[PDB]
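ZP: hey, is the Xylitol complex queued? I don't see it on the tracker
AM: it wasn't, my bad. submitting now with these inputs:
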Amino acid sequence: SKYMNNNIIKFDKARFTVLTEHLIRIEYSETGEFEERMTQMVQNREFSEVNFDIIEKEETIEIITSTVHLYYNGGEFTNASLFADVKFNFSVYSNRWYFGEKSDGNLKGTTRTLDMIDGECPLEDGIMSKNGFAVLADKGKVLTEVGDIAGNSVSTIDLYLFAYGRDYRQALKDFYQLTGNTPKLPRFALGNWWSRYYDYSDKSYLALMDKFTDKKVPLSVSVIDMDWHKVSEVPSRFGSGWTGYSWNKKLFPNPENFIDELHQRKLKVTLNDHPADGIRAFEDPYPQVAQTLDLNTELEEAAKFDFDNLKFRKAYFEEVHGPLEKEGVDFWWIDWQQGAISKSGVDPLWLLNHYQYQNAQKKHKNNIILSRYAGPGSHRYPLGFSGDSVISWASLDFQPYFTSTASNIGYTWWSHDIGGHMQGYKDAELSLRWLQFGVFSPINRLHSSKSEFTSKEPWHFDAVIEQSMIDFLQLRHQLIPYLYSANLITASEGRALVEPLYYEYPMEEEAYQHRNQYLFGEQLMVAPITEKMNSLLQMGSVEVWFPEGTWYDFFSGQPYDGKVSLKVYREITEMPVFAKAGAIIPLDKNPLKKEEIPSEIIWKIFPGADGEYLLLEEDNETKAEFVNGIFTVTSKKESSRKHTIIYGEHEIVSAKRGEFSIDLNGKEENFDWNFSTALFRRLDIAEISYEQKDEILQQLSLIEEHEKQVAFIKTNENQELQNSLFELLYSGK
Amino acid sequence: NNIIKFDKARFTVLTEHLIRIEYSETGEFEERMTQMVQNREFSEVNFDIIEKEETIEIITSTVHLYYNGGEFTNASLFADVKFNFSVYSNRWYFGEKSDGNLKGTTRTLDMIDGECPLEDG
Ligand SMILES: OC[C@@H](O)[C@H](O)[C@@H](O)CO
């Protein structure tokens, strides 16, 4: 059969597939046979036919779409024979791709891990570029129909040219169509996780879980780190106790009972797995694995780690994990730090995440793993696990940027160790700022090193820090409805929960100049504080870009007239999070109560414009509509759910059942936030002279005209104090 | 008896803790001294072998040395030491650097003001 889809062009030894007007597959084959199989990266090349034009001559071909000219001059792919011009003017002369060459503009993607990183590390390129094109090489192995490694591609060069311009959201959508959508997360993954590299007993671990309840901190996940298994008692002839599959019965004399007690507390349970030293002769499962793999047990022959080997994988899932799953382990923390070597040339991290994520689905519907990034397409195996960050202001300052930038390669479920993993320095404010970021990150998992000094328990800290941490951990559970809805949107529509500003505001230069600022779902904009407070102000700060429109602090209702770039100041207990006029945010009214789905939703409405919110749940869709001051709630299915409505400052309706409409036009649109209260608070906490406090309070109270209030603060000899006062006068204008 | 051949490789267990590893395309292995090596006469030692169709394992009191056949690559030739001095730096891979080397020396201190890099010992 000579039949070919109309989107396929062949010329010399190349094949071009025009998958969209802005996405061209580029293949080279010595043999004239081109690759149809799935690869590690690509799952789907079925794209609806698109319009394009060809200029084919003897010696050259040009493929022309709405956004790109692709040229091929025959022969081997070199920087001279294969190149493209984009039909954009985002740069004066960075509008040409050359095969095998780097161009500027790439907005970056992510990397394997933050292991041993103190602050910034280099990132790999993503598919997003300010100049409108990027090339995603497919260097992976081909897969069989059922998803096992098949060997080398017959397309010895296989590339994807993205030429979406600054339509970043559409580039990511089409990347997901190509590599497969992110699977749905389960709701439990979006709550708080407790983890610590600490040799807990059953007793001490349950006592901690019960103290979390006593302290009014909700948790969804109980992580148990490597001290669950034998460590120091492993005979040295076998190597270290890092890898283990055998319970420490001194700490866990009845593992199934312990896991059942965590299940009764509605916690999902994961164990640390260090797979690299395989199954050695001292292990509980060794007799059964040695039988299956026909090992020499009198010579203590180990079942060495080999995820290329179908029999090893089968032994690993059925005979090593299987018994631990039967005891009640819900999902696996794959903790691989042992390199990228295999006989197949496939990264063992890729093999682990691919096969473990598939195996997890027998255990539970929409199950997860926790593992490091395994390259483009590995978003199919959530969750991401960033690993052994250094505990530092510099590490925190990198992390929001790292997180939002990862959306540029579709890896949208990074779980960082909140408060940082190891080394570095103690600073309770650092631990608190890091938790603020974690709550507004894809996953909020508390974790720490083996130190006796790095517990992330709120009560480790003083009464102020402890209370603020408890408040933020409660907030995480309030946000689960919003997070779970955004999760179902990632899985169904290919939209990241965390977006860089330039996704919404691609033509605004300031959207590229606030590296740690992001959109958090569709209704909230976050600007985490990631530097130690100024002790004179007793407040930290971040420069915020406010896009055009009216914005409100999500917590205080402090207003801000966009478009402006404004330095904003917050006490260590407060975080900069903002909503536009018209925003509607659902909150669980009962974040401490372990309900499978919330019995009551708070609808938090920001007055001053129309808005809309769709709450996706396991078995329902709930639409909130705010049009000409009328707030309406409707659902796909009937339910007993109670709805609370908070319109700006004020609870209007409490615990109303069913679908309803309510006219909010006759209700107070204004937040209580006011200039005079906020000014008094900022002056009162500041470690400045009382004479300065007195004069600033007197003059700003006395001076009526806003421009002369600003002139007065402009004379202040403390420059950061001027900025803080300016923020208040700007919100109060 | 201290000598084992497998595929295109020759292993010589000189001590319980010292193993020569040779590759030869032709199956001819080198007996002559080199600039570095002057003597390969060492007393017999005890060690075990697990030889299969496609793989060999040599086991001493201190090391597992594995060879999976073919040219020597990081994947085909590697070893686990029977020690627990590190949590996961106990594996040698052919042609890869691992941590822990306490260093050796270098040709000269010509033009060196303070420290210079040393070669591995
Ligand atoms: O299992 C011990 C490890 O050091 C873990 O605590 C880290 O989180 C792994 O990255």
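AM: back. The interface with chain A takes residues 48, 50, 57, 59, 64, 66, 68, 74-76, 78, 80-84, 86-88, 90-91, 93, 96 of chain B (CB under 8 Å).
ZP: great, adding it to the tracker
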